[PDB]
Design an enzyme around this catalytic site. Sequence first.
Site, short mmCIF file in Angstrom:
data_model
loop_
_atom_site.label_atom_id
_atom_site.label_comp_id
_atom_site.label_asym_id
_atom_site.label_seq_id
_atom_site.Cartn_x
_atom_site.Cartn_y
_atom_site.Cartn_z
N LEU A 232 -0.34 -7.37 -1.15
CA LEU A 232 -0.34 -7.05 -2.57
C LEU A 232 1.06 -7.10 -3.14
O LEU A 232 1.99 -6.62 -2.52
CB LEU A 232 -0.89 -5.62 -2.77
CG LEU A 232 -1.09 -5.15 -4.21
CD1 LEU A 232 -2.29 -5.80 -4.87
CD2 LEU A 232 -1.23 -3.66 -4.23
N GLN B 259 -2.49 -6.23 2.87
CA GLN B 259 -3.65 -7.06 2.52
C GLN B 259 -3.61 -8.40 3.23
O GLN B 259 -4.65 -9.06 3.41
CB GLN B 259 -3.72 -7.28 0.99
CG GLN B 259 -5.03 -7.92 0.53
CD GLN B 259 -5.13 -8.17 -0.96
OE1 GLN B 259 -6.18 -8.67 -1.45
NE2 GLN B 259 -4.12 -7.78 -1.67
N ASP C 96 13.42 -0.36 14.83
CA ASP C 96 13.83 -1.61 14.20
C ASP C 96 12.63 -2.54 14.05
O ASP C 96 12.12 -3.04 15.04
CB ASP C 96 14.89 -2.26 15.09
CG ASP C 96 15.34 -3.62 14.63
OD1 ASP C 96 14.89 -4.14 13.59
OD2 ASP C 96 16.19 -4.25 15.31
#
Length: 320
Positions: A17, A88, A303
């Site tokens: 998104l 998404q 990380d």
Amino acid sequence: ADNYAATRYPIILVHGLTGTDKYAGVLEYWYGIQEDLQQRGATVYVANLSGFQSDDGPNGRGEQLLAYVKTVLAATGATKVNLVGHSQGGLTSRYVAAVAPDLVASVTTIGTPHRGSEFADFVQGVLAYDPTGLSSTVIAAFVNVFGILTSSSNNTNQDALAALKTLTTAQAATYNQNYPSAGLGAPGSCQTGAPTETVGGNTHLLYSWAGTAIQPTISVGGVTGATDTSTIPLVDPANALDPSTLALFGTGTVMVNRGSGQNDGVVSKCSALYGQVLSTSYKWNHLDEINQLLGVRGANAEDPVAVIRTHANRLKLAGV
Ligand SMILES: [Ca+2]
């Protein structure tokens, strides 16, 4: 430089998104990650899809990604790809694996709301309190224009209302009925499925991870408070130099007060489970998962560039 991240099949990174390969052609969604992987011998492409759309539909993100996969196969001479989706983008990757199983070797999802987001439920719910419906029309126009302006290609195919609906918990449940996966547990189980699937004779290796920086840690008078475990409490410079740190603590607080449990700010641990679940213990908010913003993370955060790189090696050793 070496071949630590060299895989048999090209990697395609798939944004979620709001995204695009490069916001305004300047800010990489996958911050520093293509560069790192390529330095370690990977063949990596970055999809550029509608930032706001459903994943299904003739002009949805899934068909866009399918088309892009075919261009990557034509360019490389390869026959399959490894799909790595954030948020998404994991749902989009599932779509391509389902509809073109011969073109996919693996699907990896990072902070993907396979069961939707309680934060999307919240926002969609807020819009229902405008009895004129004008709030939906106005804000959709605003967000759609944001998509056109920030898309690296000024993609005009933006549908903010469809994107929001797509990410609600009720709609995600319907998506899972329409696009079932052996990598998914039963609805309501907070469980994963199998580590692989074989679809039309094509085996896919399935993987996921989740960030759980946002932990519910106190309950007083029916109200749940959270803690951002990615940070040294309060003083962490990530709170100052990355505006998404506190924003995701805020949305994560909304999430836990809608019963989400531990989450990354917008996706719960349970919603994120798919395939072989490599970890749900990363002390990451949702943007830390993609090394954002601009590589800033709390002091307790692992990380994310190294995690992704190590996963490219995992894929290599697994035969893809
Ligand atoms: Ca961050």
